[PDB]
Design a binder for this molecule. Sequence first.
Ligand SMILES: [Cu+2]
Ligand SMILES: [Cu+2]
Ligand SMILES: [Cu+2]
Ligand SMILES: [Cu+2]
Lengths: 128, 128, 128, 128
Amino acid sequence: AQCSVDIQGNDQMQFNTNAITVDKSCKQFTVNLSQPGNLPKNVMGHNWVLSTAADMQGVVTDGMASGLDKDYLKPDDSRVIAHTKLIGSGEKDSVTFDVSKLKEGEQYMFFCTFPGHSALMKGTLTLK
Amino acid sequence: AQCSVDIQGNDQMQFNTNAITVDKSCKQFTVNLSQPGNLPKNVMGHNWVLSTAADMQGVVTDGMASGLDKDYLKPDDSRVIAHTKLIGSGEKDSVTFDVSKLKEGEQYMFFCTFPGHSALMKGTLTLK
Amino acid sequence: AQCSVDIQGNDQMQFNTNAITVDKSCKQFTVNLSQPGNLPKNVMGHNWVLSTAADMQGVVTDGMASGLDKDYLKPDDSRVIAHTKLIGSGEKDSVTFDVSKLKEGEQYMFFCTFPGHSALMKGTLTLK
Amino acid sequence: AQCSVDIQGNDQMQFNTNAITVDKSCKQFTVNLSQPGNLPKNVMGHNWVLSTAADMQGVVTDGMASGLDKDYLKPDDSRVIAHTKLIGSGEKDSVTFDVSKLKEGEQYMFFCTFPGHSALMKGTLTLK
Ligand SMILES: [Cu+2]
Ligand SMILES: [Cu+2]
Ligand SMILES: [Cu+2]
Ligand SMILES: [Cu+2]
């Protein structure tokens, strides 16, 4: 609602939303991530990473190779527009980015880079 | 929250929650279902059906055999404790049920009976 | 084997293979898709579509927006290297494509673009 | 060939077969599982568990909760007909079960109980 959304990854390896629309009138957008289940981050840790639909596979491939030590994301990956940290059960993290970094007409995807999760834990983001 | 929950079934064949807790102080519990997407019910229609974990397969099987006109649910199926109608994009439907029909110590599952959807559209309901 | 493969999509939204190897000596390669199930194409239609692993998500998103009469594929989608049409119960279709449209090394994916199906219906194709 | 099948589960949560046919003439049947991948047991561990289709959801829920050291299976779960251990990268494990445990006219499902996996890692087993 407004320029923010609350997203949560769960023990079923699913996100509560698979589509986000950021209104043109937002200077910034905030994503508050929560993990309501009871599984440790090493078994079911989730994060929210945003890139272009085109960069999704690269980020996911380089990400799952970095280990949970690096939250399953290549450090200083340029394709990642914004991301949360990798959290487990009971944790929460928020990320805020400037809407100036998104152009109308392009397709973005948000996803979880923890091994295998991106199969279900993905979704669309669009600036309208 | 209180004795109602709002559930969304979306166009990527996912519910927004896969676990529901019904407080024992609720005499009645209310599920409000909405379809936030743009696809029609003949293609991506969703409902919320409740049964025990044990009956889920029997209900899903007899259900997809009944067709769209029967909301993909078998009429007078005694395994269903409560259910919505099958809704499409933009539609909404609520169903209140009596919490005295659930008991402590039983595993219940909620699911969508539209063909194939219960693989991802399923979740737990337990009384507490 | 050699320059043809046969594949079946079923009512549980599963292809009977996860990987297709294309012998680099094949001039053209045929894929023969069949739907042995009972569900109609509007409820469980399956097609076989081929793109690079990087372009698949774009193809899946523009696909579901194009509707059933367009086989849930964007018309003249540059990223689609080859594709069958959407078939329902009983039906079969093939596509024969030129093998020089694939370069080796690169990763390719085959998947179904009918709504919600690609999360379960996908696999890899390698030129070997 | 013989009363045996050899099955793989890859790092992308996919078993290499959706269906297993057990010829009625076998006294016992053996499944030989291999995880031909690079990811370890705690991240992408897989197992082959067998139950009737009606019991699968119960097995998965109670399995999830049991933890890795219990191979994500409730100890002495009467609904589990047969199962392998939970394995990871380059491991193999076999299970042999009496075909007398199965009666025809009942539907069986094989699946992985590692968290999240069950929805994608599944298939049917039938007696012929
Ligand atoms: Cu995750
Ligand atoms: Cu549904
Ligand atoms: Cu399909
Ligand atoms: Cu597994």
